[PDB]
Amino acid sequence: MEITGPHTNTVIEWSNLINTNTWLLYQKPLNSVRLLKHGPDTYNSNLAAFELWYGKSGTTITSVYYNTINNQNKTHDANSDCLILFWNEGSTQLEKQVVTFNWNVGGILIKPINSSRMRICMSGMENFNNDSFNWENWNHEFPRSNPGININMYTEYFLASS
Numbered sequence: 259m260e261i262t263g264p265h266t267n268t269v270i271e272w273s274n275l276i277n278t279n280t281w282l283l284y285q286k287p288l289n290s291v292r293l294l295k296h297g298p299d300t301y302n303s304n305l306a307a308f309e310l311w312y313g314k315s316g317t318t319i320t321s322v323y324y325n326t327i328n329n330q331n332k333t334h335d336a337n338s339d340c341l342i343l344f345w346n347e348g349s350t351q352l353e354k355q356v357v358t359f360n361w362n363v364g365g366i367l368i369k370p371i372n373s374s375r376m377r378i379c380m381s382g383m384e385n386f387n388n389d390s391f392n393w394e395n396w397n398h399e400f401p402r403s404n405p406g407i408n409i410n411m412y413t414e415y416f417l418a419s420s
C-alpha cells in the first residue's frame with residue numbers, strides 16, 4: 259500500500275481512477291467541511307453526481323451542489339462525527355449516505371467497474387437506539403457524470419493505492 263499526502267491539487271482526473279482501487283483519505287477535520295464533488299458546476303438533474311462532506315457532531319451540513327434542489331435530503335443534522343455523501347444517480351433524485359468517523363483518519367474507497375463507472379464505498383461503526391451498534395458497509399455504482407467531468411477537491415487529502 260502506497261499512501262501519499264497531503265495533496266493540495268484541486269482536481270483529481272477521472273482517468274487516474276480507472277486503473278486501480280483508490281482510497282481518498284482525510285485527517286479528521288476540526289469542523290464540518292466539504293471534501294470533494296463529482297458533477298457539473300451547477301446542479302443538473304439529468305446527470306449523476308455526488309458531494310462528500312465531513313460533518314462534526316452537533317452541526318448542520320447543507321449541500322452546495324444540491325442547494326437548489328427541492329428535497330429534504332440536501333441537509334443533514336449530524337449526531338456523530340461523520341462522513342456525508344449527498345448523491346444522485348439513475349432514478350434516485352437525492353439520497354444522503356452517512357457513516358460515523360470512528361478514527362483519526364477516514365474517507366472513501368473508489369473501485370473502478372469500467373472506464374466510465376466507479377463503485378464508491380463507505381463504512382463506519384454507528385449506534386442507534388442508544389445501545390444497538392452496526393458496522394455500516396455501503397456502496398453505490400456511479401457512471402461518470404458526463405464526459406470530461408473530473409473530481410473537485412476542496413481540502414487537502416491523502417491517496418492510498420496498490
Ligand SMILES: CC(=O)N[C@H]1[C@@H](O[C@H]2[C@@H](O)[C@@H](CO)O[C@H](O)[C@@H]2O[C@@H]2O[C@@H](C)[C@@H](O)[C@@H](O)[C@@H]2O)O[C@H](CO)[C@H](O)[C@@H]1O
Nearest residue numbers: 303304305306307346347348349350400401402403404405
Ligand atoms: C441521472 C444519471 O444517472 N445520469 C447519467 C445517465 O444519463 C442518461 C440517462 O439518464 C438516460 C435515461 O436512461 O437519459 C439520458 O441519456 C441521460 O443522458 C444525460 O442527460 C442528457 C439530457 C444529456 O445531458 C446527456 O449528455 C447526459 O449524459 O447516463 C449518462 C451516460 O450515458 C451519464 O452517466 C449521466 O450522468
